[PDB]
Short mmCIF file of all heavy atoms in Angstrom, two decimals:
data_model
loop_
_atom_site.label_atom_id
_atom_site.label_comp_id
_atom_site.label_asym_id
_atom_site.label_seq_id
_atom_site.Cartn_x
_atom_site.Cartn_y
_atom_site.Cartn_z
N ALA A 44 -4.70 4.30 -3.31
CA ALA A 44 -5.05 5.65 -2.85
C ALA A 44 -5.89 6.43 -3.85
O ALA A 44 -6.46 7.46 -3.48
CB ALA A 44 -3.79 6.45 -2.50
N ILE A 45 -6.00 5.99 -5.10
CA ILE A 45 -6.92 6.62 -6.03
C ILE A 45 -8.35 6.17 -5.77
O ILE A 45 -9.24 7.00 -5.52
CB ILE A 45 -6.53 6.32 -7.49
CG1 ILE A 45 -5.11 6.79 -7.79
CG2 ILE A 45 -7.54 6.99 -8.44
CD1 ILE A 45 -5.05 8.19 -8.30
N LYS A 46 -8.59 4.86 -5.85
CA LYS A 46 -9.93 4.31 -5.63
C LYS A 46 -10.49 4.76 -4.29
O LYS A 46 -11.63 5.25 -4.21
CB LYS A 46 -9.88 2.78 -5.71
CG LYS A 46 -11.17 2.10 -5.24
CD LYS A 46 -11.14 0.58 -5.50
CE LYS A 46 -12.48 0.09 -6.05
NZ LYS A 46 -12.53 -1.39 -6.30
N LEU A 47 -9.71 4.61 -3.22
CA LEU A 47 -10.16 4.93 -1.87
C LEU A 47 -10.06 6.42 -1.53
O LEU A 47 -10.44 6.80 -0.42
CB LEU A 47 -9.36 4.12 -0.85
CG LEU A 47 -9.25 2.61 -1.11
CD1 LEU A 47 -8.22 1.98 -0.19
CD2 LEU A 47 -10.61 1.97 -0.91
N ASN A 48 -9.54 7.26 -2.43
CA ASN A 48 -9.43 8.70 -2.22
C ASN A 48 -8.63 9.01 -0.94
O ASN A 48 -9.16 9.41 0.09
CB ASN A 48 -10.81 9.36 -2.16
CG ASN A 48 -10.75 10.87 -2.20
OD1 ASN A 48 -10.06 11.45 -3.05
ND2 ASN A 48 -11.45 11.52 -1.28
N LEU A 49 -7.32 8.80 -1.05
CA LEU A 49 -6.40 8.95 0.08
C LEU A 49 -5.20 9.79 -0.37
O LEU A 49 -4.09 9.27 -0.57
CB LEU A 49 -5.99 7.59 0.62
CG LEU A 49 -7.10 6.55 0.84
CD1 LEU A 49 -6.46 5.25 1.25
CD2 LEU A 49 -8.08 7.01 1.90
N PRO A 50 -5.38 11.10 -0.50
CA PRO A 50 -4.29 11.91 -1.06
C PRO A 50 -3.01 11.85 -0.24
O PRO A 50 -1.91 11.93 -0.79
CB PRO A 50 -4.88 13.33 -1.09
CG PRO A 50 -6.19 13.27 -0.29
CD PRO A 50 -6.36 11.89 0.26
N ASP A 51 -3.13 11.62 1.07
CA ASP A 51 -2.05 11.68 2.03
C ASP A 51 -1.49 10.30 2.41
O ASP A 51 -0.56 10.23 3.23
CB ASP A 51 -2.53 12.41 3.30
CG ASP A 51 -3.78 11.76 3.96
OD1 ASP A 51 -4.47 10.90 3.34
OD2 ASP A 51 -4.06 12.13 5.12
N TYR A 52 -2.06 9.21 1.89
CA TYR A 52 -1.65 7.88 2.35
C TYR A 52 -0.16 7.64 2.15
O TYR A 52 0.54 7.18 3.06
CB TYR A 52 -2.45 6.79 1.64
CG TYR A 52 -2.16 5.39 2.19
CD1 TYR A 52 -2.79 4.93 3.35
CD2 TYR A 52 -1.25 4.54 1.57
CE1 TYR A 52 -2.53 3.67 3.86
CE2 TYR A 52 -0.98 3.27 2.09
CZ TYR A 52 -1.63 2.84 3.22
OH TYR A 52 -1.38 1.58 3.75
N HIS A 53 0.34 7.92 0.95
CA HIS A 53 1.75 7.66 0.69
C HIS A 53 2.67 8.70 1.32
O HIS A 53 3.89 8.52 1.29
CB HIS A 53 1.97 7.55 -0.81
CG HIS A 53 1.18 6.44 -1.43
ND1 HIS A 53 1.51 5.11 -1.27
CD2 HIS A 53 0.04 6.45 -2.17
CE1 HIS A 53 0.63 4.36 -1.91
NE2 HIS A 53 -0.27 5.15 -2.46
N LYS A 54 2.12 9.77 1.89
CA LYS A 54 2.93 10.67 2.70
C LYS A 54 3.09 10.14 4.12
O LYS A 54 4.15 10.31 4.72
CB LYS A 54 2.30 12.07 2.70
CG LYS A 54 2.09 12.61 1.29
CD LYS A 54 1.41 13.97 1.29
CE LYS A 54 1.32 14.52 -0.13
NZ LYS A 54 0.04 14.14 -0.82
N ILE A 55 2.06 9.49 4.65
CA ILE A 55 2.14 8.94 5.99
C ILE A 55 2.72 7.52 5.98
O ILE A 55 3.57 7.20 6.80
CB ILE A 55 0.73 9.00 6.62
CG1 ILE A 55 0.32 10.47 6.74
CG2 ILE A 55 0.71 8.30 7.97
CD1 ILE A 55 -1.17 10.70 6.65
N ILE A 56 2.32 6.69 5.02
CA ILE A 56 2.81 5.32 4.93
C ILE A 56 3.95 5.29 3.92
O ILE A 56 3.74 5.43 2.71
CB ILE A 56 1.69 4.34 4.54
CG1 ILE A 56 0.62 4.34 5.63
CG2 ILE A 56 2.26 2.94 4.29
CD1 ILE A 56 1.18 4.14 7.03
N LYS A 57 5.17 5.09 4.41
CA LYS A 57 6.34 5.14 3.53
C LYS A 57 6.59 3.82 2.84
O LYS A 57 7.14 3.81 1.74
CB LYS A 57 7.59 5.55 4.32
CG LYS A 57 7.61 7.02 4.69
CD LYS A 57 7.49 7.88 3.44
CE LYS A 57 6.71 9.14 3.70
NZ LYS A 57 7.21 9.82 4.91
N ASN A 58 6.23 2.69 3.46
CA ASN A 58 6.46 1.38 2.86
C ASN A 58 5.16 0.59 2.85
O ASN A 58 4.84 -0.14 3.80
CB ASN A 58 7.57 0.64 3.59
CG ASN A 58 8.87 1.42 3.60
OD1 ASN A 58 9.49 1.67 2.56
ND2 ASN A 58 9.29 1.84 4.79
N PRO A 59 4.38 0.72 1.78
CA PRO A 59 3.15 -0.06 1.66
C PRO A 59 3.47 -1.55 1.62
O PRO A 59 4.49 -1.97 1.08
CB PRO A 59 2.55 0.41 0.33
CG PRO A 59 3.21 1.76 0.06
CD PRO A 59 4.59 1.64 0.64
N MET A 60 2.56 -2.35 2.20
CA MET A 60 2.67 -3.80 2.09
C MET A 60 1.28 -4.42 2.14
O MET A 60 0.38 -3.91 2.81
CB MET A 60 3.57 -4.38 3.19
CG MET A 60 3.84 -5.88 3.10
SD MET A 60 4.65 -6.41 1.57
CE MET A 60 5.96 -5.20 1.43
N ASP A 61 1.13 -5.55 1.44
CA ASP A 61 -0.13 -6.28 1.38
C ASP A 61 0.16 -7.77 1.25
O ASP A 61 1.28 -8.17 0.94
CB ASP A 61 -0.97 -5.78 0.21
CG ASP A 61 -0.33 -6.11 -1.13
OD1 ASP A 61 0.55 -5.32 -1.56
OD2 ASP A 61 -0.65 -7.16 -1.74
N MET A 62 -0.88 -8.59 1.43
CA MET A 62 -0.72 -10.05 1.39
C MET A 62 -0.51 -10.56 -0.03
O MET A 62 0.14 -11.60 -0.22
CB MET A 62 -1.93 -10.77 1.98
CG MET A 62 -1.93 -10.93 3.48
SD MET A 62 -2.64 -12.51 4.00
CE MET A 62 -4.35 -12.27 3.52
N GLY A 63 -1.06 -9.87 -1.03
CA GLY A 63 -0.79 -10.29 -2.40
C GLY A 63 0.69 -10.23 -2.72
O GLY A 63 1.25 -11.18 -3.29
N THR A 64 1.35 -9.14 -2.33
CA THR A 64 2.79 -9.00 -2.52
C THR A 64 3.55 -10.09 -1.76
O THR A 64 4.47 -10.71 -2.30
CB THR A 64 3.22 -7.62 -2.04
OG1 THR A 64 2.38 -6.64 -2.65
CG2 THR A 64 4.67 -7.35 -2.38
N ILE A 65 3.17 -10.33 -0.51
CA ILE A 65 3.84 -11.34 0.30
C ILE A 65 3.71 -12.71 -0.36
O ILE A 65 4.70 -13.41 -0.58
CB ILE A 65 3.27 -11.34 1.73
CG1 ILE A 65 3.63 -10.04 2.44
CG2 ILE A 65 3.75 -12.57 2.48
CD1 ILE A 65 2.91 -9.83 3.76
N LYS A 66 2.47 -13.10 -0.67
CA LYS A 66 2.19 -14.35 -1.37
C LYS A 66 3.06 -14.48 -2.61
O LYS A 66 3.67 -15.52 -2.86
CB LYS A 66 0.71 -14.40 -1.76
CG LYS A 66 0.17 -15.74 -2.21
CD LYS A 66 -1.27 -15.56 -2.69
CE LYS A 66 -2.12 -16.81 -2.51
NZ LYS A 66 -1.68 -17.95 -3.36
N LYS A 67 3.12 -13.41 -3.41
CA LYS A 67 3.92 -13.45 -4.63
C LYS A 67 5.40 -13.57 -4.31
O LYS A 67 6.14 -14.31 -4.98
CB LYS A 67 3.62 -12.21 -5.48
CG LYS A 67 4.16 -12.27 -6.89
CD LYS A 67 3.52 -13.37 -7.73
CE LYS A 67 4.34 -13.66 -9.01
NZ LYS A 67 4.76 -12.40 -9.74
N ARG A 68 5.86 -12.86 -3.27
CA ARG A 68 7.25 -13.00 -2.83
C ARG A 68 7.55 -14.43 -2.43
O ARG A 68 8.64 -14.95 -2.72
CB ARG A 68 7.53 -12.06 -1.66
CG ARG A 68 7.81 -10.66 -2.11
CD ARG A 68 8.04 -9.71 -0.96
NE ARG A 68 8.47 -8.41 -1.48
CZ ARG A 68 8.93 -7.41 -0.73
NH1 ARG A 68 9.03 -7.54 0.58
NH2 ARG A 68 9.31 -6.29 -1.32
N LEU A 69 6.62 -15.09 -1.74
CA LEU A 69 6.84 -16.48 -1.36
C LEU A 69 6.91 -17.39 -2.58
O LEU A 69 7.79 -18.26 -2.66
CB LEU A 69 5.74 -16.92 -0.41
CG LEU A 69 5.95 -16.41 1.01
CD1 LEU A 69 4.67 -16.65 1.83
CD2 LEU A 69 7.17 -17.11 1.61
#
């Protein structure tokens, strides 16, 4: 949300997820 300039992203999206995290979890 810094790079992409998204001041409200973490207010609307409560649980972020991405494929890097999933891959690492696996």
Side-chain angles (χ1 to χ4, degrees):
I45 302 270
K46 169 173 223 181
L47 310 169
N48 191 49
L49 314 175
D51 58 345
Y52 186 82
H53 300 286
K54 305 177 176 91
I55 297 150
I56 298 309
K57 286 303 146 48
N58 303 295
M60 185 59 47
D61 66 277
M62 276 217 293
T64 309
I65 293 169
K66 193 186 209 294
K67 192 64 196 313
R68 279 178 173 189
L69 282 168

